[PDB]
């Protein structure tokens, strides 16, 4: 037969179109799943993890570190309005809190 190309590659994505498609089926969401449902969902997940790794990896550089860790992921998220609102009720293990001190608390 023909050489096996992956839906991911057909889509120009890094995330697993095949795996996402299965998770959709086996996940009991709808009864039937369109072909471009896994392609679109992966693309979005791939876009989002890229938007936060870009921000996270910078937090990492700003700290002389070459290896992203949770702190970096926190500062990445909690500083970007968009991402913070999105994960506004999620808590990141080992991520700490953002350096912030009410003014009325500083010496005068």
């Amino acid at each position: 037969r023909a050489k096996a190309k992956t839906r991911s590659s057909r889509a120009g994505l890094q995330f697993p179109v095949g795996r996402v498609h299965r998770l959709l089926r086996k996940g009991n969401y709808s009864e039937r799943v369109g072909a471009g449902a896994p392609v679109y969902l992966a693309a979005v997940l791939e876009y989002l993890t890229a938007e936060i790794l870009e921000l996270a990896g910078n937090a990492a550089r700003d700290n002389k570190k070459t290896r992203i860790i949770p702190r970096h992921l926190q500062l990445a998220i909690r500083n970007d309005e968009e991402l913070n609102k999105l994960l506004g009720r999620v808590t990141i293990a080992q991520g700490g809190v953002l350096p912030n001190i009410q003014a009325v608390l500083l010496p005068k």
Partner: protein
Amino acid sequence: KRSRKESYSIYVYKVLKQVHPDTGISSKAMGIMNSFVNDIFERIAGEASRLAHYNKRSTITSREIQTAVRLLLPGELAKHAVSEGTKAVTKYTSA
């Protein structure tokens, strides 16, 4: 033996090199990344699901995943997500 267990680690990593070639992700950090991917998948999948149900439709097409995405994500984050989704799809269907 010690049955294998799927993850999103591989792709998080690929994407990492795509934006920060020299940067590496620790382990706990990758631990978060999965939670996130899973978490957001679940949110989208569900609304997508819920949406189909509301409309007496038995299938979740990419169109479901899209509305889902606009309700879930905010501001630009959503706009960019859709641009990317749509793109990645027509490219797929476009042969």
